[PDB]
Design a protein around this ligand. Structure first.
Ligand SMILES: [Zn+2]
Ligand SMILES: [Zn+2]
Lengths: 257, 261, 261, 257
């Protein structure tokens, strides 16, 4: 709990978190509530999201959301403003991570599976960021003029994609590449934009694993979701982090297989 | 003099998207002049038909939406019908709109972001999966090589400007795909490379006010001008020849590092 | 609130280079205020002695040329003598001259390029090899961790300006080392990370005309100001705590992308 | 031999090539002579360099050169001007590629071996580039104002350094990182600056290899030095290539060991 001078405040800030019913998004939601923030959990899975909001208590709300939907994205923003009056932080954690070869025995990679991965991972992340940015721009200027922080989730697959990861790598590389042009624009509103590229974490995302985990130099294990949430926490607090993609991966460099 | 090579492009068959104009038209001209056969693919029928006509009997055109499963399959079949095989795919089809995340009239449209992704990223994947399937049937040539796939990203994948969220996302996705696709297709002797062009004299650029074009050229350290599409095509030619180039994104940009505006 | 962590920095020992000023002074202040012990290393005896004095009994200073085998070994031994162990090394020592490849008075001096490399790159390697040797003796702590090494590169490793050949080379070398060193030192539970700072309020910067400092701040998208050394130190603190950060270079730069001039 | 409109001419251009007595530098020397250029071979090894110049014929000269020496670098430039009257292209191929762990049984990595690798690979490359640039700036402006091309050699170790490659990776990453600030400056003189990052080639440089070679996705072999020279040739001819590092590696991504 020691902080630097001119650190940004996290207490009483309102977080919008996608994929919040599980894995990384669930961990960010827990971290934020435990740090004294408010959280609006967004997930397509109502059972998981309602359970998470219930477990977190009155600092949390759940809003069922398909992140690729214009309507649902707008409703998520509206839900946050209804509950807590503002939005300060968006963390995009919703994603899918299929494996499918370009060429298999049973044919070429289906176009629909590529399109779906792009839709959820990349279009969904953009949809939430454009709408969250619009809401954040309405905030009064905080310390140094800051109005909000947007944190996206890429993957080490954006850098070291394995056989079978064309769709996933394309989607996450697209997320990564957006960070800079979005940060450049949203600077005039005091909204920072950052991306975390996780390695292998213990989540439902990759539901072979053991072999990947054994290839992680140090620590020689799957990541704890709370370690991803810790980095989110630091990005929120450290105003100089902007426009960058941070690998959070134990120095993993994935092999082709 | 000679250019050291494995793949000899004479009588090999190129499938080229965006071939009615700009970079794809330049690749098509380069390939025909090097003795290759070319199947030009474009949504612009007028431009594509005129290009194939100008190039002569070594060229064919088929009007194609690269994001369509149907049209992609029809394009492969058209190439096989005309020329019996496919050796090289060059994905040049793309759109490069500018639109702010937060505009005067509201947030960036979801539909426009989706369209840019669809044409630039989904279309490139669609053509690569289908071309790879065809190439995998080829007899291995020099050094075991069955084919080469070359995609077009952009410097916007690295230095995206204000207004380029969609374009940067799409081209960053193309760039990031290169490795996992190359790793897999290596098993078939099919190389996968990406070129990230800087600012080139394309139809869109040529349509801009001269004062604007001149300012864009001035942002490029050397040569301090717009790139000529034939220079992009020359790099495509080198990638085809140089078997050691694989799994990489090459910036072709005069050392440009785009500013925010 | 809490910050999720493995390494607890209370009563752990930091070795910090360039500790008399700027970033290294800020790391030293951060570490002492978090309950750590600090061994400040600098060539500037006056600044180093004053810093250790201001920090109190949890700090020591030893005058050290980081590029010297002898001085590096003496520094390790001094830390072990005072505090019994070394847990964290932070390499902040550096020089950032500007000198053109082709100047008015002739080509860039070879001697000045060599000096910048010597201090920034050779000095960082020298201290990391010796600190790693000491850390490898530590009892494994939380999650098997014996130590953390954090190096300082620069945005110049990515976007080097005119005049920065030597600085960019040195800092690009630091950046590129991170992975092979992390891969090896993983066998000892020692993590290796690099921070690439943008424009910070260091002694050199503070000495520039205000008009100049103000223009530099204006080049940074957000926050549109010089970085505070304590913000660099805060990232150092986070790296120590967050065991999953390893083998990476983190830009801490306000989204700055330096122009050529 | 088909070229694009506005291609830069290679015939009768004068190449200065370091490390020219073996491996990649020897291949560039052969390529350039066979393409109708003049070559001044630079190497510390007089036996190898003299043999190479003899084999290439009257289009070639040898000048013994320690690339890290100010005096020898100046003499190399002077030798080129004496023989051929100008310098058009510099290709820096001289390098050493030792393997040494940070921590071994017999102690920490020697400081002297790190310093030597830096000296030859990085300081030597800078030394030759500063002096070649100064000579190139004296040329009359060619097509589009171009006066020269400088091509440096990094390595895949600049990206994917293995255990034991601290020195090599540092040196080659330093080379890579210089490309942009040097290109930015030398643009005013019409001198382009590019870097090639080779993977594993069949040269004396790496005198384990078989395992590395088996990890190269395609082509599944060591690189031919003539393929590196082919890329050099294309960089010389293609004016739009500037300020960039090109991996030439068969899609190799080196594992830790
Ligand atoms: Zn905090
Ligand atoms: Zn040629």
């Amino acid at each position: 709990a020691h902080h630097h001078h001119h650190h940004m405040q996290i207490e009483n800030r309102v977080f919008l978190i996608t994929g919040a019913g599980s894995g990384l998004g669930a961990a960010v939601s827990k971290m934020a509530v435990e740090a004294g923030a408010k959280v609006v959990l967004l997930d397509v899975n109502a059972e998981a999201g309602e359970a998470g909001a219930k477990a977190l208590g009155a600092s949390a709300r759940f809003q069922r959301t398909d992140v690729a939907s214009d309507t649902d994205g707008k409703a998520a923003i509206a839900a946050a403003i209804e509950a807590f009056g503002r939005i300060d932080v968006l963390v995009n954690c919703a994603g899918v991570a299929p494996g499918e070869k370009v060429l298999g025995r049973e044919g070429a990679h289906k176009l629909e599976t590529f399109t779906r991965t792009i839709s959820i991972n990349l279009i969904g992340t953009f949809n939430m960021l454009r709408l969250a940015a619009e809401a954040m721009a309405k905030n009064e200027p905080g310390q140094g003029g800051e109005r909000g922080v947007i944190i996206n989730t890429a993957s080490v697959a954006a850098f070291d994609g394995q056989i079978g990861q064309a769709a996933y790598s394309a989607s996450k590389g697209g997320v990564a590449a957006m960070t800079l042009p979005v940060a450049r624009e949203l600077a005039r509103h005091g909204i920072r934009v950052m991306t975390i590229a996780p390695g292998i974490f213990k989540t439902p995302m990759m539901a072979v694993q053991d072999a990947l985990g054994a290839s992680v130099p140090f620590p020689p294990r799957l990541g704890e979701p709370a370690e991803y949430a810790a980095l989110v926490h630091h990005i929120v607090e450290n105003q100089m982090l902007n426009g960058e993609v941070i690998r959070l991966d134990g120095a993993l460099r994935m092999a082709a297989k």
